[PDB]
Design a binder for this molecule. Structure first.
Ligand SMILES: [Cl-]
Lengths: 265, 260
């Protein structure tokens, strides 16, 4: 049992060790209860759990590790291990301040797919993102036996749900499909053009509980252009009651990500 | 292992965030298997009242009765479970459930078996073929852990690349036996069992000649991969119900019918 712990500035580059070492190695261990610890400012990975059973962590703060090489190391690395992690937090203070200091590529990495792990807590903190980054800036998915935040993994579920039908609309109203890269996991997708104004309209309106919208978009980027990736309502004005998420490309090739909101006067 | 006798409860219990199948109204997929046998007409015979239904599917070596799913195992893995009431007498191989068929370097197959020898000794065997090799993971049961003729058992496996477990649970006494294989226990991960080519079968494998079983089958479940952790947690709700309603792909009671 470790109750209350702080483990900081490991893998401290001036001491000149050769190689990467994590703030905490848990190797070949079992039945451990580790509550209320922090791992921060370490030069490599935060915690590496290897060949271990039944590691229980209740209240865990890992952030701003990987300080020896930006965007390279991970807060918790699992390798042939099982663990149950609750009350996880990890606000990356460097990403929040916009200092540009080297920090972890993200929270979790799975080096094997035979791990049985549950993780619950604040996996992405939700600060503004002054330099467009946050806690998890590189995400590597896993086929291991993972459950995170109690979320059902869509690849593993048979649950039946609603599935609303949108209406295709366009200058011509017949949809056209064109090839996508194979990382998209299908042969074709919907051809998006400014000429035809191809779009999908849902009749559903947004309510006070709010909404999540997502899509794979494969952009063709060239001259000055405004892409409307998705929207709520239309127009932009004191009373439009609308949201748009846009990529704006200028003549010189500068890209802006803009969110336009109109409403509430 | 840790849970060797499981006594289920009708308490207001939530374990591991799992939905208790007896308490749910969620709608799910429910894939339909095809019956196969030398005669392709299913036969149903009675089960013990502990099984909670009147009849189940009659399993015999002579007719090779089995249930074929067209679904193939994928890299995320699969769980398969059934009640089997085995009739145990002389030398015999029971193929409780299988992925694919055959057994060789390229068979891409899994078989869970109970092998009775001529002297009455029982062995539980997991046969893996693929990734260029084969492996038999088997053990002889001590006398006091042997399966008993005419007793219902819940029989379950979890199978994914690098991770195989099996469990056999007497539903009348709650006593369980099990093994789990990861890491250095496995010669290879057996990735090729899970390349979307090998289909799921209960009570035999997918080839017409395969060994089958003797006794009665009931309450066949196919789910996406569950840990033994979650399998055991779900047994505290009920010893024979589906493992995880959110991962359920098929569930067929088999009370004189292949429907639902
Ligand atoms: Cl029927």
């Amino acid at each position: 049992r470790i109750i209350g712990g702080k483990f900081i500035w490991a893998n401290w580059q001036p001491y000149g060790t050769v190689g990467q070492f994590p703030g905490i190695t848990i190797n070949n261990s079992q039945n451990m209860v580790i509550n209320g610890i922090e791992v921060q400012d370490c030069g490599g990975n935060g915690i590496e759990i290897s060949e271990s059973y039944s590691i229980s962590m209740n209240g865990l703060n890992t952030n701003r590790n990987g300080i020896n090489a930006n965007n390279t190391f991970y807060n918790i690395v699992f390798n042939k291990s099982d663990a149950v992690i609750n009350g996880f937090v990890g606000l990356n203070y460097a990403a929040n301040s916009g200092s540009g200091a080297n920090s972890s590529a993200g929270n979790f990495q799975f080096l094997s797919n035979d791990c049985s792990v549950t993780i619950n807590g604040v996996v992405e903190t939700g600060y503004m993102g002054i330099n467009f980054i946050g806690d998890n800036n590189i995400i590597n998915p896993t086929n291991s036996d993972l459950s995170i935040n109690g979320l059902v993994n869509y690849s593993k579920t048979g649950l039946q749900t609603m599935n609303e039908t949108p209406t295709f609309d366009g200058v011509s109203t017949t949809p056209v499909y064109v090839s996508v890269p194979s990382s998209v996991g299908q042969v074709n997708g919907l051809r998006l053009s400014q000429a035809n104004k191809d779009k999908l309209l849902y009749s559903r309106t947004a309510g006070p509980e709010g909404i999540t919208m997502a899509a794979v978009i494969v952009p063709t980027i060239s001259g000055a252009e405004v892409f409307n990736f998705m929207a709520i309502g239309s127009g932009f004005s004191d009373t439009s009651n609308s949201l748009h998420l846009q990529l704006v490309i200028d003549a010189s090739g500068k890209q802006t990500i803009a969110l336009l909101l109109g409403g509430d006067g | 292992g840790d849970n060797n006798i499981i006594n289920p409860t009708n308490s207001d219990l939530s374990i591991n965030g799992l939905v208790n199948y007896s308490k749910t109204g969620l709608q799910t997929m429910n894939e339909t298997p095809t019956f196969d046998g030398v005669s392709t007409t299913p036969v149903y015979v009675s089960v013990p009242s502990s099984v909670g239904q009147v009849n189940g599917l009659r399993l015999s070596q002579a007719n090779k009765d089995k249930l074929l799913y067209s679904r193939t195992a994928g890299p995320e893995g699969i769980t398969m479970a059934a009640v089997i009431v085995p009739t145990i007498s002389g030398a015999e191989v029971f193929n409780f459930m299988a992925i694919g068929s055959g057994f060789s370097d390229t068979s891409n197959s899994l078989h869970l078996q109970l092998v009775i020898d001529a002297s009455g000794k029982q062995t539980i065997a997991l046969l893996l073929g693929g990734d260029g090799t084969t492996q038999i993971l088997s053990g002889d049961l001590p006398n006091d852990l042997k399966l008993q003729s005419g007793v219902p058992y819940h029989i379950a496996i979890g199978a994914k690349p690098g991770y195989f477990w099996w469990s056999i649970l007497n539903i009348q006494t709650g006593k369980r036996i099990r093994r789990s294989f990861r890491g250095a226990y496995l010669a290879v991960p057996f990735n090729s069992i899970f390349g979307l080519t090998s289909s799921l079968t209960f009570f035999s494998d997918s080839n017409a000649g395969g060994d089958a079983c003797s006794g009665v089958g009931a309450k066949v479940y196919v789910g996406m991969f569950s840990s033994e952790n979650d399998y055991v947690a779900s047994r505290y709700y009920n010893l024979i119900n589906p493992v995880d309603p959110t991962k359920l792909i098929s569930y067929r009671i088999l009370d004189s019918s292949i429907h639902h």
